[PDB]
Design an enzyme around this catalytic site. Structure first.
Site, PDB file in Angstrom:
ATOM      1  N   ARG A 207      46.151  14.145  -3.627  1.00  0.00           N
ATOM      2  CA  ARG A 207      46.021  12.716  -3.416  1.00  0.00           C
ATOM      3  C   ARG A 207      47.389  12.086  -3.528  1.00  0.00           C
ATOM      4  O   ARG A 207      48.302  12.677  -4.085  1.00  0.00           O
ATOM      5  CB  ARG A 207      45.082  12.071  -4.447  1.00  0.00           C
ATOM      6  CG  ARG A 207      43.581  12.139  -4.130  1.00  0.00           C
ATOM      7  CD  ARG A 207      42.831  10.912  -4.616  1.00  0.00           C
ATOM      8  NE  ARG A 207      43.292   9.698  -3.928  1.00  0.00           N
ATOM      9  CZ  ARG A 207      43.152   8.457  -4.397  1.00  0.00           C
ATOM     10  NH1 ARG A 207      42.536   8.243  -5.555  1.00  0.00           N
ATOM     11  NH2 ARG A 207      43.626   7.417  -3.707  1.00  0.00           N
ATOM     12  N   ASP A 232      41.292  10.908 -10.847  1.00  0.00           N
ATOM     13  CA  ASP A 232      42.503  10.424 -11.477  1.00  0.00           C
ATOM     14  C   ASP A 232      42.584  11.147 -12.798  1.00  0.00           C
ATOM     15  O   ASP A 232      41.601  11.727 -13.246  1.00  0.00           O
ATOM     16  CB  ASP A 232      42.405   8.922 -11.814  1.00  0.00           C
ATOM     17  CG  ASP A 232      42.374   8.013 -10.602  1.00  0.00           C
ATOM     18  OD1 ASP A 232      42.207   6.795 -10.839  1.00  0.00           O
ATOM     19  OD2 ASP A 232      42.516   8.467  -9.433  1.00  0.00           O
ATOM     20  N   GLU A 503      49.721  -2.206  -6.487  1.00  0.00           N
ATOM     21  CA  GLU A 503      50.526  -1.135  -5.904  1.00  0.00           C
ATOM     22  C   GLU A 503      51.428  -1.709  -4.818  1.00  0.00           C
ATOM     23  O   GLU A 503      50.951  -2.240  -3.826  1.00  0.00           O
ATOM     24  CB  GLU A 503      49.627   0.000  -5.389  1.00  0.00           C
ATOM     25  CG  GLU A 503      49.068   0.890  -6.505  1.00  0.00           C
ATOM     26  CD  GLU A 503      47.851   1.681  -6.098  1.00  0.00           C
ATOM     27  OE1 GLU A 503      47.494   2.656  -6.814  1.00  0.00           O
ATOM     28  OE2 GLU A 503      47.239   1.338  -5.062  1.00  0.00           O
ATOM     29  N   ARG A 519      48.969  -4.534  -2.937  1.00  0.00           N
ATOM     30  CA  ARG A 519      47.520  -4.580  -3.123  1.00  0.00           C
ATOM     31  C   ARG A 519      47.109  -5.604  -4.175  1.00  0.00           C
ATOM     32  O   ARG A 519      47.767  -5.784  -5.200  1.00  0.00           O
ATOM     33  CB  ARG A 519      47.071  -3.186  -3.557  1.00  0.00           C
ATOM     34  CG  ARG A 519      45.709  -3.044  -4.173  1.00  0.00           C
ATOM     35  CD  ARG A 519      45.515  -1.583  -4.504  1.00  0.00           C
ATOM     36  NE  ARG A 519      44.217  -1.321  -5.105  1.00  0.00           N
ATOM     37  CZ  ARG A 519      43.824  -0.135  -5.543  1.00  0.00           C
ATOM     38  NH1 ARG A 519      44.621   0.915  -5.434  1.00  0.00           N
ATOM     39  NH2 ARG A 519      42.630   0.009  -6.071  1.00  0.00           N
ATOM     40  N   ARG A 581      37.530   2.165   2.371  1.00  0.00           N
ATOM     41  CA  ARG A 581      38.853   2.665   2.726  1.00  0.00           C
ATOM     42  C   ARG A 581      38.709   3.467   4.015  1.00  0.00           C
ATOM     43  O   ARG A 581      38.536   4.690   3.996  1.00  0.00           O
ATOM     44  CB  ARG A 581      39.452   3.519   1.604  1.00  0.00           C
ATOM     45  CG  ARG A 581      39.524   2.798   0.287  1.00  0.00           C
ATOM     46  CD  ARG A 581      40.304   3.589  -0.717  1.00  0.00           C
ATOM     47  NE  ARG A 581      40.710   2.729  -1.813  1.00  0.00           N
ATOM     48  CZ  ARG A 581      41.166   3.174  -2.975  1.00  0.00           C
ATOM     49  NH1 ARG A 581      41.262   4.475  -3.202  1.00  0.00           N
ATOM     50  NH2 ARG A 581      41.496   2.305  -3.920  1.00  0.00           N
ATOM     51  N   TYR A 615      45.122   6.058   0.772  1.00  0.00           N
ATOM     52  CA  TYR A 615      46.550   5.994   0.438  1.00  0.00           C
ATOM     53  C   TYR A 615      47.370   6.627   1.550  1.00  0.00           C
ATOM     54  O   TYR A 615      46.916   7.554   2.220  1.00  0.00           O
ATOM     55  CB  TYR A 615      46.850   6.668  -0.902  1.00  0.00           C
ATOM     56  CG  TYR A 615      46.512   5.828  -2.128  1.00  0.00           C
ATOM     57  CD1 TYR A 615      45.379   5.004  -2.146  1.00  0.00           C
ATOM     58  CD2 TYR A 615      47.298   5.893  -3.282  1.00  0.00           C
ATOM     59  CE1 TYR A 615      45.061   4.261  -3.239  1.00  0.00           C
ATOM     60  CE2 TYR A 615      46.974   5.151  -4.400  1.00  0.00           C
ATOM     61  CZ  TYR A 615      45.855   4.333  -4.370  1.00  0.00           C
ATOM     62  OH  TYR A 615      45.511   3.579  -5.469  1.00  0.00           O
TER      63      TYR A 615
HETATM   64  C1  LIG Z   1      47.591   5.777 -12.817  1.00  0.00           C
HETATM   65  C2  LIG Z   1      46.285   5.901 -12.093  1.00  0.00           C
HETATM   66  O1  LIG Z   1      45.323   6.348 -12.703  1.00  0.00           O
HETATM   67  N1  LIG Z   1      46.287   5.534 -10.791  1.00  0.00           N
HETATM   68  C3  LIG Z   1      45.170   5.629  -9.844  1.00  0.00           C
HETATM   69  C4  LIG Z   1      44.670   4.212  -9.519  1.00  0.00           C
HETATM   70  C5  LIG Z   1      44.205   3.491 -10.773  1.00  0.00           C
HETATM   71  O2  LIG Z   1      43.173   4.258 -11.401  1.00  0.00           O
HETATM   72  C6  LIG Z   1      43.748   2.051 -10.580  1.00  0.00           C
HETATM   73  O3  LIG Z   1      43.632   1.517 -11.909  1.00  0.00           O
HETATM   74  C7  LIG Z   1      42.400   1.884  -9.869  1.00  0.00           C
HETATM   75  O4  LIG Z   1      42.525   1.682  -8.454  1.00  0.00           O
HETATM   76  O5  LIG Z   1      43.575   4.200  -8.594  1.00  0.00           O
HETATM   77  C8  LIG Z   1      43.706   5.017  -7.402  1.00  0.00           C
HETATM   78  C9  LIG Z   1      42.785   4.701  -6.296  1.00  0.00           C
HETATM   79  O6  LIG Z   1      42.363   5.522  -5.446  1.00  0.00           O
HETATM   80  O7  LIG Z   1      42.422   3.515  -6.189  1.00  0.00           O
HETATM   81  C10 LIG Z   1      44.641   5.984  -7.362  1.00  0.00           C
HETATM   82  C11 LIG Z   1      45.623   6.240  -8.511  1.00  0.00           C
HETATM   83  O8  LIG Z   1      46.124   7.608  -8.529  1.00  0.00           O
END
Ligand SMILES: CC(=O)N[C@H]1[C@H]([C@H](O)[C@H](O)CO)OC(C(=O)O)=C[C@@H]1O
Length: 658
Positions: A207, A232, A503, A519, A581, A615
């Site tokens: 990912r 995650d 992000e 975002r 998405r 992503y």
């Molecule tokens: C540090 C971390 O955990 N980042 C993750 C992020 C996060 O959880 C957010 O708080 C909720 O979107 O979410 C996502 C996601 O696909 O949306 C990917 C990331 O890899």
């Protein structure tokens, strides 16, 4: 072995084609392979491609089909009412619809094998499911079969699951073909894989892609090598990288940029069923969300990511603690020792583990790998493996000793269970990576660190300034270095959202002028501008013409080197949908040279509006092509968890977008 039947050029226009007396007689034996080259760019919501049925009154549930959904899911049914059997196997996000304004030719290989009692499905060279059953049902053993059909399943005399698409080749074999024989089947693929199941990372899931064009012409990719399905952190995850010296045509075997060895690198097939899919590796340390940049002055390539201590992710991370004790202007890592309830130690200079209680140094040191040494002797811990052998996730010791690390669960000295950022550097542009170092805290002793924005850092074009955007609660926090990564300071920008996953990715519109896209929780992409080379930031505005869902998705953006329609150009990559998405686009923005505003003038469609896109990483390749590495699936949906080889690479030219 020859095919028992071979068809070609079939138009599926919501009307079935009967191929009974070409196929049914030739079907024999209990093992079969369907090879199908099909197209479908305006698919129905549910539609069968191929179908063998009992078409007689009272046997509506006596059939085998290969079906698809307009979400890109592929699957099979094997149903027989007399046997009491009703198999259904599928995988979401298995298909391509459209690439460069053209229907993609998917290549489907379904293997029905009686010796293993396994039904295996590949699409486009990728295995999407493989299912073993106790009681095997050969697709030609369904009782009373009297129809072989394309573009419907004939049920009690009527067309069900009517297909809109086209079949270019369908073949059947009275043979279950070897995996070796599958990989000799030719593919006309619109995508390539940089990272994939089976490579040197040994992760079965990936990912959070990144891409960056280095000055030498090399393109470099980083990614989450995710072991415990697509979850995650908390999980087992490593940052892997790969580079291309030929404009994206070929990629080097992945290596690690950041890795942990407390848990074995295991290619595991996660748990897609509803009782077991939320299984999540709970005792492992991990890295998550990488970002990359090149430093002009030193030539170094810098990569940062989040670091999570054993069992930690953003959900359970200790806010209210940075993991550091500040001592007049300096920051030291705090350590908790076995049998202690409080954090009594800090990691002073040369890695000296110092006792804050008795004010005495100890016999323990932390090396530059965050490994614990006692009187200079390496300490070790036993590694863990994961398995689902007992019908739930087990995490258990596996016999192998690895160096003991302050981020691990079995360590004598442990870091605060919160989140960190680390940087590594390469001096050979991604052939090796130096041992990561923890960034200091930017927001005090009583605040967990920010979260890195996946993708690219910004290397300002006419200075030595490096910028990595990070986010925390209620602000964007830019990390700024004017000395090749040696020192960092923060530049804060308040955002009008509480609990945003903001992000953020940056473009330098002209020297000193930075626009950040990010975002939000508003269903819209936001942006702000520094004219300060990142010292100060504007208030927040929003992009119209692109929709995001309420929770949002990471956005990637680049400043294109060449002019489009006489204007400077910005390229942006995002899903464009309020439903999920999916509906991914590269959107092309022309900068108005007077006010710095952007006219988002072309929207390029990566695949069908209904097909997953999450992503994404983009970059201008040395030849002015655009490389896209993106998650080709909905990485938010609890239905599309744990899919292998959905993070894919494509190549686009400006002509294709406009
Ligand atoms: C540090 C971390 O955990 N980042 C993750 C992020 C996060 O959880 C957010 O708080 C909720 O979107 O979410 C996502 C996601 O696909 O949306 C990917 C990331 O890899």
């Amino acid at each position: 072995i020859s095919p028992i039947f071979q068809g070609g050029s079939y138009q599926l226009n919501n009307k079935s084609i009967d191929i009974s007396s070409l196929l049914l007689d030739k079907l024999s034996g209990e093992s079969q392979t369907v090879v199908m080259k099909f197209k479908a760019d305006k698919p129905n919501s549910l539609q069968a491609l191929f179908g063998l049925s009992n078409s007689k009154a009272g046997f509506k549930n006596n059939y085998f089909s290969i079906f698809m959904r307009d979400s890109g899911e592929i699957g099979v049914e094997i149903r027989d009412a007399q046997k009491g059997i009703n198999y259904l196997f599928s995988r979401p996000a298995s298909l391509w619809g459209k690439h460069k304004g053209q229907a993609v030719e998917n290549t489907l290989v379904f293997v029905s094998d009686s010796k293993d009692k396994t039904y295996t499905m590949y699409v486009n060279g990728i295995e999407v499911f493989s299912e073993t059953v106790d009681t095997f049902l050969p697709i030609s053993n369904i009782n009373g079969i009297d129809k072989a059909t394309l573009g419907a399943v004939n049920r009690e005399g009527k067309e069900h699951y009517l297909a809109k698409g086209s079949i270019d080749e369908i073949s059947l074999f009275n043979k279950a073909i070897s995996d070796q024989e599958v990989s000799t089947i030719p593919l006309s693929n619109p995508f390539q894989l940089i990272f994939q199941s089976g490579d040197s990372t040994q992760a079965n899931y990936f990912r959070i892609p990144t891409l960056y064009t280095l000055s030498s012409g090399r393109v470099l990719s980083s990614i989450d090598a995710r072991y415990g399905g697509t979850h995650d952190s908390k999980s087992k995850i490593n940052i892997a990288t790969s580079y291309s010296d030929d404009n994206g045509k070929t990629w080097s075997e992945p290596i690690f940029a950041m890795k942990f060895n407390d848990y074995e690198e295991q290619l595991v097939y996660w748990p897609r069923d509803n009782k077991l899919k939320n299984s999540q590796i709970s005792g492992s340390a991990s890295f998550i969300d990488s970002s990359i940049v090149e430093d002009k002055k030193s030539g170094k390539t810098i990569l940062l990511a989040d670091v999570m201590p054993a069992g930690i992710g953003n959900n359970n991370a200790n806010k209210a603690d940075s993991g550091f004790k500040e001592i007049n202007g300096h920051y030291y890592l705090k350590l908790k020792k076995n049998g202690d309830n409080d954090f009594r130690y800090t990691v002073r200079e040369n890695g000296v583990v110092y006792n804050e209680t008795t004010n005495k140094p100890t016999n323990y040191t932390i090396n530059d790998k965050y490994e614990v040494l006692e009187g200079g002797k390496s300490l070790t811990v036993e590694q863990y493996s994961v398995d689902f052998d007992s019908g739930s996730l087990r995490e258990r010791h596996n016999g192998k000793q690895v160096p003991m690390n302050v981020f691990y669960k079995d360590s004598l000295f442990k870091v605060t269970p919160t989140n960190y950022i680390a940087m590594t550097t390469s001096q050979n542009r991604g052939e090796s990576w130096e041992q990561f170092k923890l960034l200091p805290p930017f927001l005090g002793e009583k605040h967990n660190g920010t979260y890195l924005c996946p993708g690219q850092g910004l290397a300002l074009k006419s200075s030595n300034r490096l910028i990595f955007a990070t986010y925390t609660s209620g602000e964007l926090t830019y990390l700024i270095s004017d000395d090749s990564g040696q020192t960092w300071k923060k530049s804060s920008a308040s955002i009008p959202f509480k609990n945003a996953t903001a992000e953020a990715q940056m473009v330098e519109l002209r020297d000193g002028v930075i626009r950040t896209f990010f975002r939000t929780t508003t269903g819209k992409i936001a942006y702000m501008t520094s004219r300060d080379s990142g010292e100060t930031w504007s208030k927040v505005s929003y992009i119209d013409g692109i929709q995001q869902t309420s929770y949002g998705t990471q956005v990637s953006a680049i400043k294109y080197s060449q002019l489009i329609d006489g204007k400077e150009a910005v390229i942006l990559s995002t899903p464009n949908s309020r439903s999920g998405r999916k509906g991914g686009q590269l959107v092309v923005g022309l900068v108005n040279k007077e006010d710095d505003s952007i006219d988002w003038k072309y929207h390029y469609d990566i695949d069908l509006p209904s097909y997953g896109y999450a992503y994404s990483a983009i970059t201008e390749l040395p030849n002015h092509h655009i490389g896209v590495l993106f998650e080709k699936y909905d990485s938010w949906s609890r239905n599309e968890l744990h899919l292998s080889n959905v993070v894919q690479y494509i190549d686009l030219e400006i002509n294709d977008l406009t």
